[PDB]
């Protein structure tokens, strides 16, 4: 599993930090922010089982029906490495995974930093997630009918800002995902609703908010601050996008250094 999920431990420090990437990327997404953390922290990197960089014949569609199974992997990794305590930085689906894992093992998670984060993407009665059922239905269809056209159109919208190198990079890894696994991950994410368990998180949490995110309405970060059970703050970046580790890595690294200073 250390081998299958490409686990890498880099840097050194008593302060261990786990970087857990989001949909459509692998651990290479952290490469620009990484040099800002390795002097000060021991950094654990890995690829989620759905990443294009993992052999897709490992993907068990049954097991990974549920984000619990991704939490299983993350915990098995940290236990394998004999790490008792860490901070965890999760983008996108990994923000959901970090919430769940911090509830299962509150001893292990000393602090969460959540990027591109939401407890629920679908709208509900007075809950604004940012997506409707029929809208997602059409997206799932497009992923199946022509994955590559879908990915081409989605990449610049996710990056948000006009930063061509970041669009090229996210595209590279989105095109790397096997299209059946990419659809299955999105379907799984869109069936998840963590609203009810947010109060069970005990760890302090920093929610990173950019000025626009296609997948995360502005109102979600305040909702997380009001409902997460630990001491939470919202930290604002002065730029837009869902992937600030790709589009504004120097700015995001300022927030990461401050958030990872003591825990």
UniProtKB/Swiss-Prot annotation:
Expressed in the parenchyma cells of the root stele and lateral roots, vascular tissues of vein and leaf sheath, ligule base, auricle base and stem base. One of its GO terms (biological process) is strigolactone biosynthetic process. The active site is at residues 92, 213, 242. Changing residue 242 to Y: Weakens interaction with D53 and attenuates strigolactone-induced degradation of D53. Disulfide bonds: none annotated. It is found in: Cytoplasm; Nucleus. Substrate binds at residues 92, 186, 242. One of its GO terms (cellular component) is nucleus. The keyword Cytoplasm applies. Keywords: Cytoplasm, Hydrolase, Nucleus. Its main location: cytoplasm. Changing residue 242 to A: No effect on strigolactone binding, but decreased enzymatic activity toward strigolactone and loss of interaction with SLR1. Its EC number is 3.1.-.-. Belongs to the AB hydrolase superfamily. Involved in strigolactone (SL) signaling pathway. May function downstream of SL synthesis, as a component of hormone signaling or as an enzyme that participates in the conversion of SL to the bioactive form. Strigolactones are hormones that inhibit tillering and shoot branching through the MAX-dependent pathway, contribute to the regulation of shoot architectural response to phosphate-limiting conditions and function as rhizosphere signal that stimulates hyphal branching of arbuscular mycorrhizal fungi and trigger seed germination of root parasitic weeds. This is Strigolactone esterase D14. The gene is D14. The chain holds residues 56 to 318 of 318 of the full protein.
